[model samples]
Target: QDSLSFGFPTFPSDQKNLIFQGDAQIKNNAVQLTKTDSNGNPVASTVGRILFSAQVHLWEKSSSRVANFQSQFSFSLKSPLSNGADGIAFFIAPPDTTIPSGSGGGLLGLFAPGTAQNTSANQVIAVEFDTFYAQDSNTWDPNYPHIGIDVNSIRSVKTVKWDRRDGQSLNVLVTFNPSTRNLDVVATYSDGTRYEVSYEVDVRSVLPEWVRVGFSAASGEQYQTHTLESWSFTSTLLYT
Candidate 1:
């Protein structure tokens, strides 16, 4: 086969090659990843998810060479309550992955409550842009508005704060290199502040031969709206 690649300057009306779950919907050509009332007010305790349906090849089955991948996306977060409850995450999970039963608040639609532990069965690699902090005990969240990397768990082996600007645009580039066995994430906040972080995790070990890629976000008591405006992804595998 060949390298896998795709781009979404803006979500199309038919939403080709995409899956919408929970409260996710296309409004004004962007993913409106939360719920709102008839009065245009943000709703509480809502969760939403959107992802590419077709699986991306992560490794060659016969040679077992892991591919290098990169995903870039533009998004924004706004809170009606003045403080956002949670934020958004970009994830690559198994092709067979589905929405867990409880996917709100800190879980970010990628995890179920009490199940985001370090288990091989959880097989998901994700980078989270967190807006609120709690249970620093369980989540290990450093502080509000941070970036964290997760492998099979949301506890995040690494975390750092992000300068958040409510309702302003945020951009992220996530890249993985098989040679380094590291996934690097670079984020640019509204005011042009940039943050870079990375963690080591072998995708061939944590994920299946193929995987789904996309975004997930939601809020609990406090409310916020997460909108994904654009996205692009590419992956290539080289085998000897």
Candidate 2:
């Protein structure tokens, strides 16, 4: 018997020359730098799977920057996206120079402050894998955080509990189907069972022909630190 498999390789390095380098000339194309630790190395970028870690940074300010994929592709790590600092956010904004606001917690690293410039015109959809709850004093819910799909505002059309497990590994996969105009997210445990903690977001129409995708993690006061062991993503096409 003969068995055959057809698909792209896993690691980004394997794709070598097929990768898209950053295009700084595109409109509203930028990666902002906010806060940093003592070493002064504010951000980190690494490649894994088909997805690349673009705006990888620790606890930093929200410097209203964007990864413009207009003529190019972009992925950013902001507010809720670091390993163990505050939190982070992911965005695809209109071509402009408007910087996002920076609030405490992981929000500063990935999004604008909750009180200012929080609109969908600067559209965003974030999976806040949060570990801390800043909601009320003397109250605690230590196992999860809110995952949201934000429109032109800070409110979420779809929100859910991003449950967590200790001493376990988590795998997140985001896929896009251009023919269907649908985006799907799948989160699974190392054990290999698919969890319903998935979402169907509208992206095919919004996402540019080429785009940047990546991961971010953060840790705050109550929570010690958050780390991204490994992350990956795939797209339908690649342009020259």
Candidate 3:
């Protein structure tokens, strides 16, 4: 099922479903859960690339709190065939949260775990369109956050500088191919181009068949706001 709308109230009220509940209160934002899989994992059956666009702004904090670890957005594509990567992105962060300093890390947290502190380009794959840079920046060389693609977890990927504007809309696309044992991730900017990030592991690499695809985000002491304009996924399987 496909529903398209623009402006405030981004999603249809009747279709709202809660995939995962959080302990944080959103000031001027809203969240919804749409669909689940046969095994009860969260999912939206809509095929092709689902478009989600929104305006976001984050703030920094002075201390750490539980709300910082909570994800701002999450949904799963439970595949009845394989377990894919646990996909997520944090466009905003506070000190309590972990993301490459400023916003230059590409694919913000594609393969990186939250426990990482030092910015190592060999452990993560990030495509950050970030701003602000500290001399000891956690991200690779600091400059105007542009379009860069990284692989490796959170510390091992390459961070390149590209041209990106302020508060511009970003696009993230997650695709799964059970037959090929591959997960493809592509993120686009307000401009017409996009960066590619792929997980070479099969769905079985993470879990069994009939897995759930999910998306999540959060902000704590460094960033405060998170928005998911839209999201969509596709799946295919074969029997032995």
Candidate 4:
């Protein structure tokens, strides 16, 4: 059995069951995950970010021992001024809908500062689209505006530059196959170019049975509009 399977053209009219925090909102017939006001002031500052999660688990481990899932969504990040700061991420975290305080820019609102680096303590797994480049303790490639897979850490296990241009319609597909223990990511740009990446991940190793699935984004001194045009997710529960 699966726990959730649905799509949002804009946002569901009946949104009482959705979980949104920070600067996230449903406006302009799309999900505005994060944005700056007309004065160009970032909506969030020390904790400048947005989060959109399903009120229910995408896949429950108790009923479904293993989780196999796939999700597809379209998004665009644009700025009237310049390239944006920070970026966005797709994540699976604990069931709570609270947004972590003091998480902006590089933290991507997925975890608190200094907490993500600890593998033993951090509980979130995320696929990040990072736009900022600041040398930090974690190894960072010279080329920014990249996509990465983060496992309880901001440091990317694998990363590649995001191929689509700003303002382009980008399609992303993510799949998790339990038998292979593989997580796959595919991105298609409006120009029809496609990029793909994959990683080995055993969900049970780092995540609990029931987890929230959602998108999170952030900005630093520089800001941009991160919008989710549409999204859908489906999954199958596996028994041991």
Candidate 5:
């Protein structure tokens, strides 16, 4: 696989291999996922969803069964209010790039509301930065900001609360080690503190040979600005 490096400083206008859908846009050299409009104003009662994927297949079924990758990015969520609904995620989904309808808030714009738990066939894996809590049955924690690693379901397999302040730039790094089947994540805050977690995942089981890697975010009744300042990824191709 090839390496990818992009940021607001020198974003490519015409990358034939890149795809942006829904509220995702390249503006001021950064990728704005949700909340703000063309002029950077908040939208009332918005349910913004966005997806960014590489048009070219990173892996083919007959090509590889093992994969190792590392991804790093910077993001910030801002709002005038004291609280914001929903959050953001870095995910690998099927080729479908369409934003699921009614996927705002706790759904994180990655899975449709009602279908998340039982949708066995939905091939997806994600690491989420959830700022708010869902008051529903699947809610893990109440009004706590946390990081979650999810597979097939938004009900995270692993979750841990952290101190996440609004308008502060944060850095996240995700690494997947195929040999150990481990996914490790480290999030660094502006104050230099770090929140780290890891989970074991069989990539072959939840993902297909060809997958779309990107970011997704949503804001329901209470909205906030979600922005991606920079991103980079590198992967090793495998053959078996």
Candidate 6:
């Protein structure tokens, strides 16, 4: 059986099957994705990512198999000195995906600056929670907090406003339907606010048969803190 499943109700000090990159680390049992000062305050111009160590099997052509996956993660974003620049994302990328160089700011630690997107090697899919609005002709992002779907590009093909409040914890659920190729995202804040968005995409089309799943974030020149409280994921490949 080609299947994968894991749950991290709390990423304890001795967690396994997880890789922390750049300034990302486990702090107080939470995944902290950027640098913090001695006071535990967030620093500026930070970029990092956290990925599951094992690659997940997505599909197999010989067996006519495809995988259906469901994931839920809880997180929070806060900026004390500034309104917050850049944001964070839950992403699926090529096996052993690493943080791209010069991928700060709106790049979300996924792609290097000014790099061609959607290439065979640079392909990536993500659900982005964006806070800053890029004015460049390429990105024209929304001013306030928003959620979108990005496929190997910094700009999103689909978007919806995200009512993200500072320091407010958000519970997010993402699911992929193999039949419809729909990727759905739903989130609820600790204060009871809800947001939902969806896009059509197939992982098998963009990435290799095996891919890494995880979170990526960047602070750019602005100050921000991205924290992951907990996460759970499951995927089952159907062979017919």
Give candidate 4 misplaced runs (Cα > 4 Å): 1-3, 12-14, 38-64, 136-142
lDDT score of model 6? 0.83
- On residues 1-240, what C-alpha lDDT tens digit does candidate 4 reach at each position? 355677776674456656768877766677777765776344544232333454334445445567678889888878655657678788888787467666777677777776756778688888887777766622444555688888878777777777536688789999988888889999888678887778998888788776778888887776677777888888777664
Q: Quantify all predictions' global Cα lDDT against the true fold.
A: 0.82, 0.35, 0.32, 0.72, 0.73, 0.83
Judged by whole-model lDDT over C-alpha atoms, candidate 2 comes out at 0.35
Model 2 TM-score, all chains together: 0.49
Candidate order (lDDT): 6, 1, 5, 4, 2, 3
Identify the runs in model 2 with alpha carbons over 4 angstroms from their true place.
1-101, 106-108, 114-117, 136-146, 150-154, 192-194, 197-210, 238-240
In model 1, how large is the Cα lDDT of residue 120? 57
Clashes of each: 0, 30, 55, 1, 1, 0
Better of 2 and 3 by lDDT: 2
Over all chains combined, what TM-score does candidate 4 have? Answer: 0.86
Quote each prediction's TM-score.
Answer: 0.93, 0.49, 0.43, 0.86, 0.86, 0.94
Clash pairs (backbone) in predicted model 5: 8-29
Model 3, 212-232: lDDT tens digits are 233333221223123344443
Per-residue lDDT tens digits for candidate 1, residues 1-240, read: 448898999886777688888889888788888887776567899998888977888887788688988999999877767677678899988877778987678788888776777465588888998887866523456756688898888778888777768788888899989888889999887667899899988677778888789889888887888889999999989562
- Model 1 misplaced stretches (Cα beyond 4 Å): 136-139
Error of 6 at 213 (Å): 0.6
Worst 10 residues of 5 by lDDT: 1-10
lDDT of 2 at 216: 34
Find the candidate with the highest lDDT and give its number: 6
Winner by lDDT between candidate 5 and candidate 2: 5
